[PDB]
């Protein structure tokens, strides 16, 4: 059983589209939430990373949480935006430190940041969705394979 | 009244220092407080900061605070150890943008980081400590300089 933590700072644009794209997946045996390392409680989606993900048929009504203990003790796998965001949940909770990775280290190998696009425009937007819709699609692959490979009983 | 709250991440090292250094000149009319971004509650100031202020006769409890919106309320002046954290504290609370400065900026009207020791050698916590007490120095100058200026009547 997968638990998915997306993390970036404020949980209003790149940890919530990585979330909703998972979740989109609706893959069985994964669960999905997204936190802020430093994050306002109940904020919105913002309003360009609502819209490219509207373009790509999903309205999630995303509510922002600020990172707390209690998330790093449910996930599974906490998948960081970029380095830093990883470098601050380790030093911050280093309890994570054998389950917390970058989102493109955990599914690629190779380090690698997602760009943040807040206050840029909706491209700037389309394309952090693009980044983070393909790395989905490589982690959904990455997830279901390892389930395949290990499933036993009747 | 002043109300000086000093911010970094873990409230371990740097902001501790500068709530020590300015704390330990019981300046009339000024109260000090320190904060981090993401930071556990209770801590102790690390190893190297108390070394380091014990060398210059300070020897102060220290409990790290995560920074919250009430510190943010109370607070005429947050003075930020970077100008990575000024950017995060007015990103997460819009209302602090007129009175967050880093404390180089407000002191000297230049940008400045302080030396981070990326919780190194004693060495580097000297030299933040001693970028400090330069600062904070000149951060007490403008202070009384202000409160004296504008004191009327007995």
């Known amino acids: 059983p997968y638990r998915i933590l ?3 700072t ?5 940890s919530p589209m990585a979330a909703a794209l998972l979740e989109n997946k609706q893959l069985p045996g994964v669960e999905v939430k997204s936190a802020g390392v430093f994050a306002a409680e109940g904020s919105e989606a913002s309003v360009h ?3 490219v993900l509207k373009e ?3 309205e999630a009504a995303h509510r922002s949480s600020q990172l707390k203990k209690e998330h790093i003790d449910w996930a ?3 998948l960081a935006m970029t380095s830093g965001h990883k470098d601050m949940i380790v030093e911050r909770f280093p309890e994570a430190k054998d389950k917390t990775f970058t989102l493109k280290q955990f599914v690629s190998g190779t380090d690698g940041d997602i760009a943040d696009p807040f206050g840029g425009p ?3 937007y389309r394309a952090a969705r693009d980044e983070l819709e393909t790395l989905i699609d490589r982690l959904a692959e990455k997830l279901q394979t390892e389930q395949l490979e ?3 009983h009747h």
């Open 150 to 152: 290990h499933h036993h």
């Open 122 to 124: 909706i491209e700037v």
């Open 49 to 51: 990373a609502k819209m």
């Open 6 to 8: 997306f993390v970036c």
């Open 76 to 78: 599974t796998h906490v």
């Open 10 to 14: 404020g949980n209003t644009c790149r």
């Open 56 to 58: 790509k048929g999903i």
